[PDB]
Amino acid sequence: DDELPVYQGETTQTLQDYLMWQVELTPFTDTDRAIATSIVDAVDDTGYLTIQIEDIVDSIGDDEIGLEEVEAVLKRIQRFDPVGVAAKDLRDCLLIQLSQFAKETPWLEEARLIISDHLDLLANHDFRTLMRVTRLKEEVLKEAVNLIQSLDXXXXXXXXXXXXXXXXXXXXXXXXXXXXXXXXXXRSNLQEARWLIKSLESANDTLLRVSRCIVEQQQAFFEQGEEYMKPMVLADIAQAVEMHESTISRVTTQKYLHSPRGIXXXXXXXXXXXXXXXXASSTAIRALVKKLIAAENPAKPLSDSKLTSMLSEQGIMVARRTVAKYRESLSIPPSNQR
Amino acid sequence: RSPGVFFDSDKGKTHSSGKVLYNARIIPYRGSWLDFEFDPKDNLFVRID
Amino acid sequence: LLKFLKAQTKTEEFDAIKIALASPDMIRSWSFGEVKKPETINYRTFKP
Amino acid sequence: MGHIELASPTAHIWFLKSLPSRIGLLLDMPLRDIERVLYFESYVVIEGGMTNLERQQILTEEQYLDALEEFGDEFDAKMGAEAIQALLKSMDLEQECEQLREELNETNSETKRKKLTKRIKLLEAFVQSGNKPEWMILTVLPVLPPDLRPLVPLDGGRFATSDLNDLYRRVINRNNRLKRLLDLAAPDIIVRNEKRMLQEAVDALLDNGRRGRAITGSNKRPLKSLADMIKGKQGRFRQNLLGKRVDYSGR
Amino acid sequence: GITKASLATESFISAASFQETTRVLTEAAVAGKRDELRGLKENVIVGRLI
Amino acid sequence: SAAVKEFFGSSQLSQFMDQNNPLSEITHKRRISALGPGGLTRERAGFEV
Amino acid sequence: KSDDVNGRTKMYKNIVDGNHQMEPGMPESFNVLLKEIRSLGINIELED
Amino acid sequence: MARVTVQDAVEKIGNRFDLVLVAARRARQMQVGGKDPLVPEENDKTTVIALREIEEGLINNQILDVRERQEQQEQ
DNA sequence: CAACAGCATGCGCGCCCAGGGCTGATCGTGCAAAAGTCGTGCCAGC
DNA sequence: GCTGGCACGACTTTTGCACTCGACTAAAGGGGCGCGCATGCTGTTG
């Protein structure tokens, strides 16, 4: 309705909204505005990625309209407010961000064009042999690299994500004797509707009792003090109150339990039974696998088979494949550096 | 408005003929209200809440 | 194949706004398909 | 937009309770009559020639047991709003308007000479108009586009339902429950109470007035409805109509 | 008598927005009347010159 | 507890204090209001009170 | 300068360019009203 | 040459509502393009230019019609 | 004893803010067809 | 010949209709007003 501040909206501006605003105000032709609108949607909240170019060209359905037309227009779009916008590959991002250094920057212009244009793939590790490639030495190259490292990446300045999306918790786990104890914190027609409320008010009091109950059984199923969490099956919680698996997983999926470590509520009931006599499921396998891979490789061992042998020494019956596959995942440099 | 017994003339601004219509309301601290009134035809009536 | 204009589709020039009862058939002409369930947005997925 | 399909066509309280009642004065019935017999109460005998009972009359349930006892068949009386749809469907506009104007010609007292002219100018409006009277009580209920019912997002996340959404949720619950009990082939009592409950629900989604209480247990307040939804002051004052809040301005 | 005389205006859009909206729109919906846009409030609400 | 801290928290008769001026403080803390919980909904009160 | 969305844009772009010309359209809030009356079983449509 | 009062240009064309139409149709030309002022510019905006040309009697509805027919005939 | 005209009571307009306030949860009940992922083996690179 | 990546399989997880009846004792509000229109009961005209 009106005359009050109903949550009508804010109409904030994202990056694509703002870029399109910036396109509205620039001297594009009828067609070039179609290519521009075609590119600004391709852009991402991350900036740099304008995804595939030749799909931008082919998306228009031929009829002339070469590659060069989208290329020029593309450059000009890449030139709008947040300096380096879009482009591709980060290389051209840093070349567009480097396009304006005012040209009055000492030593930076040339060196920066050489480093940023080409050979930047080898600049990851360190200088080393690159120092011999560009003939530079001492701090001449190091100061240019200070500028290159001073650039930042793409957009993510427009952002428009003021919403942190907090957790709000649901049930509090007051820590007891090296464990956890639940408390669960935080005329006649409508009169007959009043009655439904009595039932809703009676169920509202038991809503906390379900959280404290399932929470108590969840604390009894997995040891808190132990590394990760003891392996459990939904059949235990389904054994206690005799509730269906999907229902319990739904309650733990919706609500989020706050313990002293982890905010992480439905992950405390999901585990494997390992299917082995000698033995914390995949939690400690992948967790402690990445932990053992954290301190290792004095220089560049890059050996996942040695880590698989170390896992087999612990009595987990490693397959040298599964263990290495789960260990090398999630950004793990293992086996990649070989 | 304090609890206890109250009286009102209505100032005969209803019936357009004019009268004196004397109604008495009892006001508790918490509970129902009893208000006795007069009819245009001069009969006492009881209202509850 | 593109040159796609949302702004240009409605220039519609009218006179006299008209009014009348809506038949169930005309209702179904407006209808995009039926809403069969009361719930709104899933609280997990954060999708409708 | 959207739409929802109703089991038993009900309400549309916008007509009928906006005085005067077009459904009342169209069918030559008092609004206590039709208002009384929309939900529950009487059975609203319709049609059924060759008997004691007339065309538009009502009766008590005990009089219905006596009716089916004596007359049996040839008395057809639909208790829900379908009798208003049936009666309303069987209304023949041309002949009735004509004989009513003729009847007006020989009349005398100015009292009866007014009502009649109201019915002539009404029914005549339906003829020249081209609307079917049936349409007044509605079957398919259209639903309002999503973005103009926004969801009132909270402080910590976890969006809470707006005021107008509650009415749609409610109607949908009663529609699904009346459909479920209707397809179940169950007694007329409970599905009857479901017809009642759903006319209450749709009439509450179109106007939270019309009768009493409405509201909720939310701290209550009448809530708001699509009627109330009309531009802040229930004029189009606000928002439009001379009243835009505005740009390049300061103070 | 000036409120009677507003509500009785030929254009169903004005006078709907004056006072009584339910009533107005019901007379208009049943009757099937067209606005013609001939006065100043209608033109405003549609957004056109007066 | 929820009833008591509900009162003092939120209530028409518990309001934030006027803290500019001493005399604002004072005159806030001796004030007699006709409004609230106990009566005088206003706009409907009339011109005699 | 309030609810015409395409027309606010065109307006401001012409101003930046020195045109000072309006290109007025139809304000949102009318459109809304037409949906909200369509939400009762009344059609209101704009006839040319 | 800021104009405080339009009366002088209103005697030229009756009903100012007409003046405003003619003033702005003439000013539009100089504003957007494809015209030059008939009167020496005093640095003023184009609107005042137009009202001055109306106050001088150089421009009016008939004159703009004759110029329109002349420009359409010459094109 | 008939219909007709009048007096009266009730109901719905207006005025006008008024403030929020909220609520999220919940709950299940089977069974069954389809799919995400961990495990194991096979093939290719060094 | 050894390690790492990926393909194939099983499992076990994900996902789709369709119902379930329960019920209890309050919680309060609450000093405008006009204006008009309609319904209803009364009353007097013949």
Coordinates of C-alpha atoms in Angstrom, one line a residue, chain G residues 15-31:
Chain G
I15 CA 20.4 17.4 -21.5
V16 CA 24.0 16.3 -21.4
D17 CA 24.1 16.8 -25.1
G18 CA 22.3 20.2 -25.0
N19 CA 19.1 19.2 -26.7
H20 CA 16.6 20.2 -23.9
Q21 CA 13.7 18.3 -25.4
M22 CA 11.4 15.9 -23.4
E23 CA 10.2 12.7 -25.4
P24 CA 7.6 12.1 -22.7
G25 CA 6.3 8.6 -22.1
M26 CA 3.8 6.8 -19.7
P27 CA 4.5 6.8 -15.9
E28 CA 5.0 3.5 -14.2
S29 CA 2.7 4.1 -11.6
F30 CA -0.3 4.1 -14.1
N31 CA 0.8 0.7 -15.3

